[PDB]
Design a protein around this ligand. Structure first.
Ligand SMILES: *[C@@H]1O[C@H](CO)[C@@H](O[C@@H]2O[C@H](CO)[C@@H](O[C@@H]3O[C@H](CO)[C@@H](O)[C@H](O)[C@@H]3O)[C@H](O)[C@H]2NC(C)=O)[C@H](O)[C@H]1NC(C)=O
Ligand SMILES: *[C@@H]1O[C@H](CO)[C@@H](O[C@@H]2O[C@H](CO)[C@@H](O)[C@H](O)[C@H]2NC(C)=O)[C@H](O)[C@H]1NC(C)=O
Ligand SMILES: *[C@@H]1O[C@H](CO)[C@@H](O[C@@H]2O[C@H](CO)[C@@H](O)[C@H](O)[C@H]2NC(C)=O)[C@H](O)[C@H]1NC(C)=O
Ligand SMILES: *[C@@H]1O[C@H](CO)[C@@H](O[C@@H]2O[C@H](CO)[C@@H](O)[C@H](O)[C@H]2NC(C)=O)[C@H](O)[C@H]1NC(C)=O
Ligand SMILES: *[C@@H]1O[C@H](CO)[C@@H](O[C@@H]2O[C@H](CO)[C@@H](O)[C@H](O)[C@H]2NC(C)=O)[C@H](O)[C@H]1NC(C)=O
Ligand SMILES: *[C@@H]1O[C@H](CO)[C@@H](O[C@@H]2O[C@H](CO)[C@@H](O)[C@H](O)[C@H]2NC(C)=O)[C@H](O)[C@H]1NC(C)=O
Ligand SMILES: *[C@@H]1O[C@H](CO)[C@@H](O[C@@H]2O[C@H](CO)[C@@H](O)[C@H](O)[C@H]2NC(C)=O)[C@H](O)[C@H]1NC(C)=O
Ligand SMILES: *[C@@H]1O[C@H](CO)[C@@H](O[C@@H]2O[C@H](CO)[C@@H](O)[C@H](O)[C@H]2NC(C)=O)[C@H](O)[C@H]1NC(C)=O
Ligand SMILES: *[C@@H]1O[C@H](CO)[C@@H](O[C@@H]2O[C@H](CO)[C@@H](O)[C@H](O)[C@H]2NC(C)=O)[C@H](O)[C@H]1NC(C)=O
Ligand SMILES: *[C@@H]1O[C@H](CO)[C@@H](O[C@@H]2O[C@H](CO)[C@@H](O)[C@H](O)[C@H]2NC(C)=O)[C@H](O)[C@H]1NC(C)=O
Ligand SMILES: *[C@@H]1O[C@H](CO)[C@@H](O[C@@H]2O[C@H](CO)[C@@H](O)[C@H](O)[C@H]2NC(C)=O)[C@H](O)[C@H]1NC(C)=O
Ligand SMILES: *[C@@H]1O[C@H](CO)[C@@H](O[C@@H]2O[C@H](CO)[C@@H](O)[C@H](O)[C@H]2NC(C)=O)[C@H](O)[C@H]1NC(C)=O
Ligand SMILES: *[C@@H]1O[C@H](CO)[C@@H](O)[C@H](O)[C@H]1NC(C)=O
Lengths: 209, 727, 727
C-alpha cells in the first residue's frame, strides 16, 4: 500500500525539541506529491544522496520532522556546539542523514503553530547550597528531559520552568529555560531522513509499475 | 578670634575649592576654568582653550551640564534639568558640532530624554526616551529605535526602576557600551506585579487639587521586580529593519527563585561578566560569556562560573565586587574575604575556581583602581593599622613579595585618606588627599612615581581659616572584651582636659558604614563644636566595616540589637573621662541613624537626655525589599518573623516616657515613606507620651532644597540648644 | 482646696447628668435608666416598665442604640456602629417583636444599612442599603425595592452626599414620610462630575501599605452635584409591580442655572412645600404643590409659589426658615427678614404674595417650636435685649398682641438660656436650661403653664463640686462707633480686678455664629482658668449674629477683612483695662477660628506674642463650594477673583517673623484637608520662619479619639505653658 504521510498533515507542526518521527517499512511513496507539497531550501546529506532515495528501494525509512526557522539554518548543522544540539535535537552523523530546511507553500494544509521556540538551558542543579550546575546534554536521537515543561511551546521569550526531580530522576531541581523566535510568513520546516538496510524482509519503494 | 557660626555653614562663606578633571587621553585632561573648557597637557602643564567662553554653544537656554565626545568633535549640552529621584532626572539635549562652528539642528535628540551616553570611542550616541532605547550613529542622522516595549511605570528598557537605582546599582544608567563600542548591553526591568506606594503631592500653591504620586516600591516580603538582560550589535542597525536584541539568560543555580543583577563589566571586546545574587543574599555568582560570531548568542560555559558564598553573613560589603580584567582578558583580580574574614585581592583565571591571595594581613584592601601589565595599584588601610585611613600601594604582577607605598611619606601629617584618579593607560594619576588637613590635589607620573606639580592646595581657604576658631579632631580606640573599636571626637577649640563638656552622639551605625575616619569635613558638627562648644562623638560598632567580617557580620539577622548595645556601651565608656557631662547626653542620627536613635531612646538606659531622628525607620516591613532582606531574609513565621516583630520601634514606645524626642520627616520622601513616622506618632500618642514633630511638605529623603535645608538645620539647632540648655 | 486639673478634664471626673426623653403619644414618654426603659405618664408622674434589662437581647453583641415604633408594637436594636462622616455612619439592625417575647428571624434589616426610619404611624420601615431605598410594610415581610439607580460615589438615593449633608441638611437622611405615611418623598444626588479629593490613610500598624481614601468633594468654583426629587405612593407597591416614582420638577425661575433645594415640609397630607435656592445664595423659591388623586399628576400652579430675595447679602441664617403650616394647610408662618433686617414671623396665605408681619422689635426670633389652633410658641432672644439669651414665648393666633413669656420669671438668676421640646399635639413640654447655672430639666403642662416636677437638678454634682475652685464667667458688651458687640471672659477663681492677669483669646468668629452666650460649659478654658490663672476671652463682632442683617451682611464678599480687623481692635480694646498684660496675650482657634488666628498673626499688629491654630483655613479656593460661595460668590475674574487672591494666608507668610506659631492638623481630616496646612508650612519654610508643628495621624476634624484628644490637649497645654513662661 501507499506510504501514510497523513500524520504529518494533521495538527500543529511540532517544535524542534518536541519533534515527531515516522518509520516507513513495506510501503510505496508518490514522489509527484512530495515534489509539490514542499519547497526545498537546502538538501544536506551525510554518506547518502537524494538521487538515490528517490530511485532506490530501502529496507526502512525514518523521518524526523519539526518546525524550524530558516534563519537559524546552520545552527542545526552537524558538529555545531550551539544550544540546538545540546538541548533540542542532535542527529547522529553516523546515521545517514539528509537534513532538509524547506518552506511550506501557502495552500498546503499544515497548521502553523505560534512563534517558534528552543530550550536555552536544561540543567540538573543539585548540591547542598544548590551550587552544582551539572548541565544535562541530550544524547543523539534522545528527547530533552526538559521537553514536558511546555510541550505546545513558549508563551514569552526567556521563560523559566522549575520541576523538582525525585531520587529515581536523580535528585535536585530540574531547571529549564526557553527562547521564542517570531513566526515567519510561511511555515518553515526541517526534516531528517535516514535509510536503514537489512532491517527486515520488506522494503520501502517509490510508486512505480 | 571669630568662630564658625551657623550662618557660615548656611551661607557657605568658607567654600571648599575642588579640582575636577576628566582624562580624555593618556596625557591630557579637560578642566572648566571660568565656564570655558581648557585642555591641559600633563607633562608640561601648558594650557590651551578647547571650547571658547560664549553663549554660542546653546544661546537662549541656560546650560546645565555638558559631555565631550571621545573624539572631541562634538559636544552634548543638556538644559531644562528636572531631578526626579536621587539619580533619575530628565532634560533636553542639543549637539554642538565643535569641529567647525555650529550646532546641529537636524534630527535633534527628543525634548524629554531620560539618559544619554557616548560610545567609548567614536561619536555614537545612545539615549532613552519614553523608556525606549534609541541609537544615533552620527549626530546629524536620524535615530534608530532599539526597544518597543517601553511603558511608563510598568516596563523600563535600558533604565532602572526605583529599587535597582537606589539599592542595587546606585546609579540611574542601565546600559553599557562595549570597549570597542560595537556592542551595547542593557537591562530591562518589569514591575507589573510590584505594589505601588501612593502619597500626596501638593506642588505649587495655585494647584487647587493635590495630586497622588504612585511609585513602584517593593517592600519587605513583596513581589520583587524581574530583570532581563540583552545586547544589541550597533553595527547592524538599518533604516528599514527592526533592531535585534540577543538575550543572555541568568545562570541555572541563580534563577531558581527571586534574584538580582549586581553589575556587568566588559572584559575584552567580545567577553562580558555578570554578577547575579540570590534574593537571600548568599551564593553570589560571577558568569563570563563570550560572543560567538557563528551564533549571535552568548555561550556561558559552566567551567567559567565563579561562586561566592558566605556563612557568618552576607556577600560583599554592599554588592559583589567588580572584577578588573587583564589586557588579554583571560585572568582578573577580585576583592574577596579570606578564611580569616579579611578582604584581600585574589587572582582568578577564567577557567579555574581556586583563587591565589596576593595580599594577607589583619586589614582589608579597599579597592583596585588601575591595572597594568607590570604593576597593580590599589587603595588599602594597612598603614598604621588604621581602619579610617586610606593609602595607595602598588604590587608587581611578577613577584607579589614586593609591595611599594606611593602615598605613605608624601605628606603624613596632612594626609591619611587618599583617593586616586588614573589617566588613560595609566601614564599619569591625580591624587586627592581628603584626610585630616585641607584637601590637596596633585598630579604624578606612574613611570617613575615623580611628583609633577600641585594642582590645588586651597591656600586661600587656609589663609581665611587662619582667623577662624576651627575645632580639633581626635581618632582613637577603646577595648571592649578582647577587641578594640574605633571612635572619633570633634573637640571644641582650646579644648580643656579638666572641664566637663556635653556630648552629642552623631549616629549612622548602619551596616558596612563608617563614621570614624580621617576625612576633613566642615558641617553641622563643626559649627556645634566651634560656636556652641559641644563635643561631637561617633563610634564604630559591630556592623561597621573596613575592619573585618568577624566584626562585620556580628549583626547578621539580628538588626538593631548589637549595634544599639554597642552604642550604649560606647556612651558608658565615654562617661568616665572628665570631659563628658553624664547628665546632658543626646543621640542624633539620620535615616538608619534615626532608627538607631529611636531604639537607643527606647532601650531604657536613661543615659541620654534627648534625641533627634530624621526620617527614621520604624518597622522593617515598611522598608524596601532588597536592603532589609540583605540582612534579615524574609519576614515569614518559619524563617525570621519573630525577630521582625520584636525589632520595632513602636514596641518600645512606652520607654520614651523618660526622654524628649524630636521627629522630622518630609511628606514626599520616596525612600523612607512618611508612613513610618506616622506609625511612630500613632504609637507615641496612644501610649500618651509627649514629643516634638516636624514635617517638611514636598521634600524628598535628602531634604536638599535650599530653604528646607536651612529650616531643618536651624530647627534642629534650636532643639539641641534648649535640650542641653545652651542659651 | 482642689483645683480643676488637666486630669480632671481628660478623665471626666465631673460628669454632667442630663434627662433625654422621647415622646410617643399625647401624654407619655420613655426614659432610659441604666439598662431598662421606663414609660412615664406626664400628668401623674407614675412610671411603668416598658423594657427590662434584656442584656441577653443579642446575647453576644452590645446594643448601641434603639428605636421605638410609634405604636409600641416593635423595637429596633442597632449595633456594630461605625462612624463614617460627621453624621454618616453604618451599622447592623435587628427588629424585635416587643409584643410578647420573640425576635424576628425571617427577613431582617441588612448588615451594612446606611439609614433606617420608622413610619410616623403604623410600623412601616424605610431603609437605605447600597445607596438604594427599600420599604418593608411589616417587619416579617420582604422589602420592596424603590430605587434602582443606586451606585456608590455616583448616585445617592435617599441619603445625602458629603456637601449636602455637611452644609445644607446637617443630616444623612434625605427621605421624608407623609404625616399619615401614605406618601414617601426623597431626593437623588448625582455627583458624576464632582472632583475627587484623595488623602492617605495609614490604618493599623500591621497594614504594610497605606490606603488612599477618595471623597467626592466640590471645591470653590467646581462642578456642583445635581439633585432630582421624587415621590412614591407607599400604599401601592406590590410584589409583581415595579416601584413608581413621580418626579417633581424645579420651578421655572430655578432651571436657568445651578440651584439647591433647602428643605421639605409636609403641609398636610397631599400638600407639600419645597424650598429651592439658586447656586448664587441671594434668591430663594418656596413652591407648594397639591396632589391630585383623581389624575395622579402634580398640577401645582405657579400662582401659589412664593419667592424670597435679598439685596445686602444671602437669604437666611444658613437656609430659608422652616414653614409651619396650619392644621387645614391653607396658611403658614415663616421666619423672614423684615424691612430693617431683623427676622420675625410673617403670616402667609397660599394664594397671595404679600406677607403680613405679626412681630417686630430690635431682636431676633431664633425658632418656631409649635403651632396650636390658638397659640404659637417660639424661642426668641427679646428678654433683656441679650443676643446670648433664649426664652420661650407664646402668642395668640387671633390677636397676636397678647404675648406671654414662659421662662422669664420662673428662674431669672440661675437660668437665662432655655431650650424646649413639646409633646405630641403639644400638651406638655420639657424645658432644658443650659446656663449660666447648672443644667436644669423640668416638665410643664400647656394648659395653664403649671410646673409638674423637676426631672433633673444635678444637685449632687453641685454639692460635690462645692469644694473645687471653679472659675467665673463674665458677660458684657463694648461699643465701637454706634454699634455694640458682646464678649465673655472666663476669669480665674479669686479673680483680682487690680492685679495683672495674662490673656488668651479664644476665637471662632465665623459668619452667623455666636461664641458670646450664657451657656455653662466645662471645657479647656475652665481648666486653664482654674489652674494657670489665664483669662480666656471671646468676642462676637461682624459678621456674627444674631443681631440683625446690618451686622450679618456687613462682611458679605469681604471675608477676613472686617472680621479680622474687628478681632484686632477687640484685642487692643481688651488691653486697655488694668488687669490684662499686653505683652503676654496669646490667640487660638479651631477651623474657621484657625483661619482667623492665621490672618491676625499675619497682620503685623505685634500685640499677640504667640498663637496656636488647629486645622486652620488658609485659602478659600481649597474649601468646599457651598460654604465659601455663600459669602464670596464665584471665584471668577469678573465677579470676585481679585478678593479671592487678596485674602490668602500665604501672602502674609513673611509677616510671621515676629510671632511663634504652632500648627496642628490631622492627616485624615475630610473637611479641612491636610493640603491646607501643608501649603501653610511650605510657604513658611520658603520664607524661612521658625515655627512648631505637630501632626496627628488618622485623626479627623474633631479629633474625637480618646487618646488623641488627651494628647492634643496636653500638647497644647505644654506649648502655652512654655510660651507664657508659667512653670
Ligand atoms: C424594575 O425596573 C428595574 C430597572 O432598573 C429592572 O432592573 C433591571 O432589569 C434589567 C432587565 O431584567 C436588567 O438587565 C439584565 O441584566 C443582566 C445582567 O446579568 C443580564 O444578564 C440580562 O440579560 C439583562 O440585560 C438590569 O440589570 C436590572 N438592573 C438592576 C439594577 O437590577 C427590574 O428588573 C424591573 N423589575 C423588577 C424585578 O421589579
Ligand atoms: C604643550 O606643549 C607641547 C610642546 O612642548 C605640545 O606638544 C605638541 O602637540 C602637538 C599636537 O598637535 C604636536 O603636533 C606637536 O608635535 C607637539 N610638540 C611640539 C613640537 O610642539 C602640547 O600640545 C602643548 N599642550 C597644550 C595643551 O598646550
Ligand atoms: C523642544 O521644545 C522647544 C520649545 O521649548 C521647541 O521649539 C519650538 O518649536 C516650535 C516649532 O518650530 C516654535 O513655534 C517655538 O517657537 C519653539 N520654541 C522655542 C522656545 O524655541 C523645539 O522644537 C522642541 N524640539 C524637539 C526636539 O521636539
Ligand atoms: C572593535 O572590536 C570588535 C571585536 O573585536 C571588532 O569586531 C570584529 O572585528 C573583526 C576584525 O574586523 C572581525 O573579524 C570580527 O568578525 C568582528 N566581530 C564582531 C562582529 O563584532 C570591531 O571591528 C572593532 N572595531 C570597531 C568597530 O571599533
Ligand atoms: C512583564 O510581566 C508581565 C507579567 O509577567 C508579562 O505579561 C504576561 O506574560 C505572560 C506570559 O509569561 C502571560 O501569560 C500573561 O497573560 C501576561 N499578562 C500579565 C499582565 O500577566 C509581560 O509580558 C512582561 N513584559 C515584558 C516586556 O517582559
Ligand atoms: C518593529 O516592531 C514593532 C513592535 O511593536 C512595530 O511597532 C508596531 O507596528 C505595528 C504594525 O506592524 C503597529 O500596528 C503597532 O501600533 C506598532 N506599535 C508600536 C509600539 O509602535 C514596528 O512597526 C516594527 N518596525 C518595523 C517593521 O521595522
Ligand atoms: C544560604 O542561604 C540559604 C537559604 O537560601 C541557607 O539555606 C538553609 O539551609 C538549611 C539546610 O539544613 C536550613 O536548615 C536553613 O533553614 C536554611 N536557611 C534559610 C535562611 O532558609 C544556606 O544555609 C545559606 N548558606 C550559608 C549561610 O552558608
Ligand atoms: C398612672 O396611673 C393611672 C391611674 O391613676 C393609669 O391610668 C389608668 O390605666 C388603666 C390601664 O392600665 C386604665 O384601666 C384606667 O382607666 C386608667 N385610669 C385613668 C385615671 O386614666 C396610668 O396608666 C398610669 N400610668 C403609668 C405610666 O403608670
Ligand atoms: C437592671 O440592673 C440594675 C443593676 O445594674 C438593677 O438595679 C439594682 O437593683 C437592685 C434591686 O432592686 C438594687 O438593690 C440596686 O441598688 C440596683 N442598682 C445597682 C447599683 O445595682 C435593676 O433592678 C435591674 N432592673 C431590672 C428590670 O432587672
Ligand atoms: C451579618 O454578618 C454576620 C457575620 O458577621 C452574619 O452572621 C453569620 O451568619 C452565617 C450564616 O447563618 C453563620 O454561618 C455565621 O456563623 C454567622 N456569624 C456570626 C458572627 O453570627 C449575619 O447573618 C449577617 N446578617 C445579615 C442580615 O446579612
Ligand atoms: C448623572 O450625570 C451624568 C452626566 O455626566 C449622566 O451621564 C450621562 O448619561 C447620558 C444618558 O445615558 C449620556 O447620554 C451622557 O453621555 C452621560 N454623560 C456622561 C459624561 O457620563 C448620568 O446618567 C447621570 N446619572 C443620573 C442617573 O442622574
Ligand atoms: C444676586 O447676585 C448676582 C451676582 O452678584 C447679581 O447679579 C449681578 O449684580 C450686580 C449688581 O447689581 C451687577 O452689576 C451684575 O451685572 C449682575 N450680574 C452678574 C455678574 O451676575 C444679582 O443682581 C443679585 N440679585 C439680587 C436679588 O440682589
Ligand atoms: C570667560 O569669562 C571670564 C571671566 O569668568 C573672562 O575673563 C573671559 O574673558 C571670558 N571669555 C570670553 C568672553 O571669551
Amino acid at each position: 500500500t501507499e506510504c501514510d504521510f497523513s500524520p504529518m498533515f494533521k495538527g500543529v507542526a511540532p517544535q524542534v525539541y518536541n519533534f515527531k518521527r515516522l518509520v516507513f517499512s513495506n510501503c510505496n511513496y508518490n514522489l509527484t506529491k512530495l515534489l509539490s507539497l514542499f519547497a526545498v531550501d537546502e538538501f544536506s546529506c551525510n554518506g547518502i544522496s537524494p538521487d538515490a532515495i528517490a530511485r532506490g528501494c530501502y529496507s526502512t525509512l525514518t523521518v524526523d520532522y519539526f518546525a524550524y526557522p530558516l534563519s537559524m539554518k546552520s545552527y542545526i548543522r552537524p558538529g555545531s556546539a550551539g544550544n540546538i544540539p545540546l538541548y533540542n535535537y542532535k542527529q547522529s552523523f553516523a546515521h545517514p542523514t539528509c537534513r532538509v530546511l524547506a518552506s511550506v507553500p501557502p495552500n498546503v494544509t499544515i497548521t502553523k503553530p505560534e512563534a517558534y521556540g528552543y530550550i536555552s538551558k536544561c540543567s540538573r542543579l543539585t548540591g547542598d547550597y544548590q551550587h552544582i550546575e551539572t548541565p544535562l546534554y541530550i544524547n543523539p536521537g534522545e528527547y530533552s528531559i526538559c521537553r514536558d515543561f511546555a510541550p505546545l511551546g513558549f508563551s514569552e521569550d526567556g521563560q523559566v520552568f522549575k520541576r523538582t526531580l525525585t531520587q529515581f530522576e536523580g535528585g535536585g531541581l530540574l531547571i529549564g529555560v526557553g527562547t521564542r523566535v517570531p513566526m515567519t510568513a510561511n511555515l518553515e520546516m526541517g526534516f531528517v531522513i535516514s535509510v536503514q538496510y537489512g532491517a527486515g524482509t520488506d522494503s520501502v519503494c517509490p510508486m512505480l509499475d | 578670634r571669630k568662630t564658625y557660626t551657623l550662618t557660615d555653614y548656611l551661607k557657605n562663606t568658607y567654600r571648599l575649592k575642588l579640582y575636577s578633571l576628566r582624562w580624555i587621553s593618556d596625557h591630557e585632561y579637560l578642566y572648566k576654568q571660568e565656564n570655558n573648557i581648557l585642555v591641559f597637557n600633563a607633562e608640561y602643564g601648558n594650557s590651551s582653550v578647547f571650547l571658547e567662553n560664549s553663549t554660542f554653544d546653546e544661546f537662549g537656554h541656560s546650560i546645565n551640564d555638558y559631555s565631550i565626545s571621545p573624539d572631541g568633535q562634538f559636544i552634548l549640552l543638556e538644559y531644562n534639568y528636572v531631578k526626579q529621584w536621587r539619580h533619575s532626572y530628565t532634560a533636553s539635549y542639543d549637539i554642538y558640532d565643535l569641529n567647525k562652528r555650529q550646532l546641529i539642528t537636524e534630527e535633534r535628540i527628543p525634548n524629554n530624554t531620560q539618559w544619554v551616553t557616548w560610545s567609548p570611542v567614536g561619536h555614537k550616541l545612545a539615549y532613552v526616551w519614553n523608556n525606549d532605547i534609541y541609537v544615533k550613529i552620527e549626530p546629524n542622522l536620524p535615530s534608530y529605535r532599539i526597544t518597543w516595549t517601553g511603558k511608563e511605570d510598568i516596563i523600563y528598557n535600558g533604565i532602572t526602576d526605583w529599587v535597582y537605582e537606589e539599592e542595587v546599582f546606585s546609579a540611574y544608567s542601565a546600559l553599557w557600551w562595549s570597549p570597542n563600542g560595537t556592542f551595547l548591553a542593557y537591562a530591562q526591568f518589569n514591575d507589573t506585579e510590584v505594589p505601588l506606594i501612593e502619597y500626596s503631592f501638593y506642588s505649587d500653591e495655585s494647584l487647587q487639587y493635590p495630586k497622588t504620586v504612585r511609585v513602584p516600591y517593593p517592600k519587605a516580603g513583596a513581589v520583587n521586580p524581574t530583570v532581563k538582560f540583552f545586547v544589541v550589535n550597533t553595527d547592524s542597525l538599518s533604516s528599514v529593519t527592526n533592531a535585534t536584541s540577543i538575550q543572555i539568560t541568568a545562570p541555572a543555580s541563580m534563577l531558581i527563585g527571586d534574584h538580582y543583577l549586581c553589575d556587568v563589566t566588559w572584559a575584552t571586546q567580545e567577553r562580558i561578566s555578570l554578577q547575579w545574587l540570590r534574593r537571600i543574599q548568599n551564593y553570589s555568582v560571577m558568569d563570563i560569556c563570550d560572543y560567538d560570531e557563528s551564533s549571535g548568542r552568548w555561550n556561558c560555559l559552566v567551567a567559567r562560573q565563579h561562586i561566592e558564598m558566605s556563612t557568618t553573613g552576607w556577600v560583599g560589603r554592599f554588592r559583589p565586587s567588580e572584577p578588573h580584567f587583564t589586557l588579554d582578558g583571560n585572568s582578573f583580580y577580585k576583592i574577596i574575604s579570606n578564611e580569616e574574614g579579611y578582604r584581600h585581592i585574589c587572582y582568578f583565571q577564567i577557567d579555574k575556581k581556586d583563587c591565589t591571595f596576593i595580599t594577607k594581613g589583619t586589614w582589608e584592601v579597599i579597592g583596585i583602581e588601575a591595572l597594568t601589565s607590570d604593576y597593580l595599584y590599589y587603595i588599602s588601610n594597612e598603614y598604621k593599622g588604621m581602619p579610617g585611613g586610606r593609602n595607595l600601594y602598588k604590587i608587581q604582577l611578577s613577584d607579589y613579595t614586593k609591595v611599594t607605598c606611593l602615598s605613605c611619606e608624601l605628606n603624613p601629617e596632612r594626609c591619611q585618606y587618599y583617593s586616586v584618579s588614573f589617566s588613560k593607560e595609566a601614564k599619569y594619576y591625580q591624587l586627592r588627599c581628603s584626610g585630616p588637613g585641607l584637601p590637596l590635589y596633585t598630579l604624578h607620573s606612574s613611570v617613575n612615581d615623580k611628583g609633577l606639580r600641585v594642582l590645588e592646595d586651597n591656600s586661600a581657604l587656609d589663609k581665611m581659616l587662619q582667623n577662624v576658631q576651627m575645632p580639633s579632631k581626635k581618632l582613637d580606640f577603646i577595648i571592649l572584651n578582647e577587641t578594640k573599636f574605633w571612635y572619633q571626637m570633634i573637640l571644641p577649640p582650646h579644648f580643656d582636659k579638666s572641664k566637663k563638656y556635653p556630648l552629642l552622639l552623631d549616629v549612622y551605625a548602619g551596616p558596612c558604614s563608617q563614621k570614624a575616619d580621617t576625612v576633613f569635613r566642615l558641617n553641622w558638627a563643626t559649627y556645634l563644636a566651634s560656636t556652641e562648644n559641644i563635643i561631637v562623638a561617633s563610634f564604630d560598632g559591630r556592623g561597621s566595616g573596613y575592619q573585618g567580617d568577624k566584626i562585620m557580620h556580628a549583626i547578621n539577622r539580628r538588626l538593631g540589637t548589637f549595634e544599639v548595645e554597642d552604642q550604649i556601651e560606647a556612651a558608658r565608656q565615654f562617661s568616665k573621662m572628665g570631659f563628658v557631662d553624664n547628665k546632658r547626653i543626646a543621640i542624633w542620627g539620620w535615616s538608619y541613624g534615626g532608627y538607631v536613635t529611636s531604639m537607643v531612646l527606647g532601650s531604657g538606659s536613661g543615659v541620654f537626655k534627648c534625641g533627634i531622628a530624621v526620617a527614621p525607620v520604624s518597622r522593617w516591613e515598611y522598608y524596601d525589599s532588597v536592603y532589609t532582606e540583605r540582612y534579615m531574609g524574609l519576614p515569614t513565621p518559619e524563617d525570621n518573623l519573630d525577630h521582625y516583630r520584636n525589632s520595632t520601634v513602636m514596641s518600645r514606645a512606652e520607654n520614651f516616657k523618660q526622654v524628649e524626642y524630636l521627629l522630622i520627616h518630609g511628606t514626599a520622601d520616596d525612600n523612607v515613606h512618611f508612613q513610618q513616622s506616622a506609625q511612630i506618632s500613632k504609637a507615641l500618642v496612644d501610649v500618651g507620651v509627649d514629643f516634638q514633630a516636624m514635617w517638611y511638605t514636598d521634600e524628598d529623603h535628602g531634604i536638599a532644597s535650599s530653604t528646607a535645608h536651612q529650616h531643618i538645620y536651624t530647627h534642629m539647632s534650636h532643639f539641641i540648644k534648649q535640650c542641653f540648655s545652651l542659651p
